[PDB]
């Protein structure tokens, strides 16, 4: 229940599963690795993560052990090129979530009976981060979105899913003024949302929780503890992590509501260089 609880490595032991073990082969993506805690108390929430178009899962793979070491199952999927559009990326993520849902009943799976399939999140890089936010539109029962330097040009983001957007100030591929910032502002004002731009960060800056000197992981994990796991003890943690993280940011926009130990906080603050 403190910003110290956001340490990389968390406390749980991490193991992995894949199609090599019998995991469902989802038709809408190319390969999965499931990172899961071996010694957390069931059930576990899950997050599905997808890299940008053409990019291999190794580009975002450090999120897997990070989230799983904190009790959150992570399914990282690859792509074979299909369509150069963030909407095929949304459907890939939804198919990854179906793989998680089936995994909860898969005979011989170490995760049989251990997944809370109503606590599902999505995350993605570049067009995968546009896809993650569109996945929330297409399936508004998803519990959180973590977008990593998202790319999506003509966004309709009509959803109520708490969404955390990371961006890179120096991102040439998905420049924040044309992407992340627009995604933040077109998401409904009543939707819980948070925008964090890494000062001088390139397009890859949120590909690992170590981005922003660790700020990326601290904010992402706090966000999921609150909105995916429904653990209000992490409301004040996120707030502290945000203040602590301003040193490495060039822009923060907050518009989210959160219950702490003493009451309700409706944060709408903005930081700019
Ligand atoms: K496949
Ligand atoms: K799979
Ligand atoms: K705050
Ligand atoms: K809001």
Residue numbers in the entry: 6 to 278
Publication text:
To ensure that this C-terminus does not affect catalytic activity, a deletion mutant designated PET30ΔPorC was created that lacked the sorting sequence between the amino acids 300–366. Activity tests confirmed that it was not affected in its activities using pNP-C6 or PET foil. The crystal structure of PET30 without its C-terminal Por-domain (PET30ΔPorC) was solved at 2.1 Å and displays high structural similarity to the IsPETase. The structure was solved at 2.1 Å resolution, containing one monomer in the asymmetric unit, with 16.2% for Rwork and 21.9% for Rfree. The PET30ΔPorC protein shows a canonical α/β-fold consisting of a central twisted β-sheet composed of 9 β-strands flanked by 7 α-helices on both sides, as already reported for homologous structures, i.e., PETases and cutinases. The structure of PET30ΔPorC revealed an extra β-sheet (β10) which is located at the C-terminus and connects the PorC domain which has been deleted in this construct. PET30ΔPorC represents the overall fold of several PETases as revealed by a similarity search performed by PDBeFold. One disulfide bond is present in PET30ΔPorC (C262-C285), a common feature for Type II PET-degrading enzymes. Here similar interactions of the HEMT molecule by the PET30ΔPorC protein can be deduced mediated by Y178, T200, H230, W152, F80, and M154. PET30 shows a less hydrophobic surrounding of the catalytic pocket when compared to the structures of Type I and Type II PET-degrading enzymes.
